[PDB]
Scaffold this active site. Structure first.
Site, short mmCIF file in Angstrom:
data_model
loop_
_atom_site.label_atom_id
_atom_site.label_comp_id
_atom_site.label_asym_id
_atom_site.label_seq_id
_atom_site.Cartn_x
_atom_site.Cartn_y
_atom_site.Cartn_z
N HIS A 1 0.85 -1.20 0.00
CA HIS A 1 0.00 0.00 0.00
C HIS A 1 0.89 1.25 0.00
O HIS A 1 2.10 1.14 0.26
CB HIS A 1 -1.02 -0.06 1.14
CG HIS A 1 -2.18 -0.97 0.88
ND1 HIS A 1 -3.47 -0.54 0.99
CD2 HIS A 1 -2.26 -2.27 0.52
CE1 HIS A 1 -4.31 -1.53 0.71
NE2 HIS A 1 -3.60 -2.62 0.47
N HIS B 1 -5.74 -2.62 -11.15
CA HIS B 1 -5.45 -3.72 -10.21
C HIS B 1 -5.38 -5.04 -10.98
O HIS B 1 -6.25 -5.27 -11.85
CB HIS B 1 -6.52 -3.79 -9.13
CG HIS B 1 -6.27 -4.88 -8.15
ND1 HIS B 1 -5.26 -4.81 -7.19
CD2 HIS B 1 -6.82 -6.11 -8.02
CE1 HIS B 1 -5.26 -5.93 -6.50
NE2 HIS B 1 -6.20 -6.74 -6.98
N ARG C 1 -8.42 -5.07 6.54
CA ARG C 1 -6.95 -5.14 6.71
C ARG C 1 -6.68 -5.81 8.05
O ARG C 1 -7.15 -5.28 9.08
CB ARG C 1 -6.39 -3.73 6.64
CG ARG C 1 -6.78 -3.00 5.37
CD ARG C 1 -6.34 -1.55 5.32
NE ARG C 1 -6.83 -0.99 4.06
CZ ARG C 1 -6.30 0.03 3.42
NH1 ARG C 1 -5.25 0.67 3.89
NH2 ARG C 1 -6.84 0.41 2.28
N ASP D 1 0.68 -5.06 -6.28
CA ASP D 1 -0.20 -6.24 -6.43
C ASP D 1 0.61 -7.53 -6.32
O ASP D 1 1.04 -8.08 -7.34
CB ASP D 1 -0.99 -6.17 -7.74
CG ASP D 1 -2.04 -5.08 -7.72
OD1 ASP D 1 -2.35 -4.56 -6.60
OD2 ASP D 1 -2.55 -4.76 -8.81
N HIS E 1 -3.59 1.02 -2.89
CA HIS E 1 -2.49 0.20 -3.45
C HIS E 1 -1.36 1.11 -3.92
O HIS E 1 -1.63 2.20 -4.47
CB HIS E 1 -3.00 -0.74 -4.55
CG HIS E 1 -3.86 -1.81 -3.97
ND1 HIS E 1 -4.28 -2.90 -4.69
CD2 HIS E 1 -4.31 -1.97 -2.70
CE1 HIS E 1 -4.97 -3.69 -3.89
NE2 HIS E 1 -5.01 -3.14 -2.66
N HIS F 1 -4.87 -8.85 3.95
CA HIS F 1 -6.34 -8.69 3.97
C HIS F 1 -7.03 -9.91 4.57
O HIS F 1 -6.47 -11.00 4.61
CB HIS F 1 -6.84 -8.39 2.56
CG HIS F 1 -6.51 -7.02 2.07
ND1 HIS F 1 -7.29 -5.94 2.36
CD2 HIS F 1 -5.48 -6.57 1.29
CE1 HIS F 1 -6.76 -4.86 1.79
NE2 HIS F 1 -5.66 -5.21 1.12
ZN ZN Z 1 -4.72 -4.16 -0.22
ZN ZN Z 2 -3.87 -3.38 -6.66
#
Ligand code: ZN
Ligand code: ZN
Ligand code: ZN
Ligand code: ZN
Ligand code: ZN
Ligand code: ZN
Ligand code: ZN
Ligand code: ZN
Lengths: 150, 150
Positions: free
Chosen positions: B50, B74, B140, B86, B66, B123
């Site tokens: 992040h 994404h 999170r 990612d 992100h 996550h």
């Molecule tokens: Zn995330």
């Molecule tokens: Zn992402």
């Protein structure tokens, strides 16, 4: 754009309960350091930027020595002969709560001297601001990594 | 010397117990990501870099969105259409232990794409690798800041 703010959440080493948050904010005169910590023994604790953003060791030793890109001696924040990481002491009150605010004229968020991705270490003992290479501040009671804020 | 290694210790957000260590090591073929986590619900968990290295919030929301310096969509680690952050999913076993190892060809330790001082977020749910802009991985459960290793 340019980093204006850094944030460091510190977590206790094994056998300590020291926690808290340190923020670094660009000001006209340099960088405003604001620390709000808890769980400290009352009195003065060495308060330093160490060279590795590695808090994986149980005792914080993974953080390495003081952040010292200028290859200088250990000193006080107000000394010209200091490590970039020499942020002096934080004082805990009778309840273990520690608050610090000061303007540091050496720490930056970009280039070779950047503190981003380095560690904050809080020490068990006072930094005497003179003894090489750490000010005789002893064990590491908490460790955190300095991250980019918004 | 150029950073060859980054380290991230993750700590739980308030309602969780997820802990662990993530290392990033320069290899011939890219950056080797190695994650060793515990305290996860069994199954797949979104595993992301992040944009803010700020783990101060109770729920990890301080870490922001992100890490996406290329302003892309994404996706999965193997996709060309992905955020730098990612890193897909990490799988926890029946005991809540999670191991991940893979070679990432996009993450670096210097310049605009540098992951140093960014956050790792784990996550609650699986990253579906498709839903914009986050993969719908839900809450999170853990946050840490990526630091410079020796
Ligand atoms: Zn995330
Ligand atoms: Zn992402
Ligand atoms: Zn306070
Ligand atoms: Zn120190
Ligand atoms: Zn020093
Ligand atoms: Zn230099
Ligand atoms: Zn493996
Ligand atoms: Zn850019």
């Amino acid at each position: 754009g340019k980093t204006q703010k850094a944030v460091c959440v510190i977590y206790p080493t094994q056998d300590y309960k020291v926690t808290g948050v340190i923020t670094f904010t660009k000001s006209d005169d340099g960088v405003k350091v604001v620390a709000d910590l808890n769980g400290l023994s009352p009195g003065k604790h060495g308060f330093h930027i160490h060279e590795c953003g590695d808090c994986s060791a149980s005792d914080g030793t993974s953080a390495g020595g003081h952040f010292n890109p200028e290859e200088k001696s250990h000193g006080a924040p107000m000394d010209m002969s200091r490590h970039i990481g020499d942020l002096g002491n934080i004082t805990a009150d009778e309840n273990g709560k520690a608050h610090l605010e000061y303007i540091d004229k050496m720490i930056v968020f970009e280039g070779e001297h950047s503190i981003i991705g380095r560690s904050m270490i809080v020490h068990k003992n006072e930094d005497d601001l003179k003894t090489q290479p750490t000010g005789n501040a002893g064990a590491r009671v908490a460790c955190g990594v300095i991250g980019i804020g918004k």
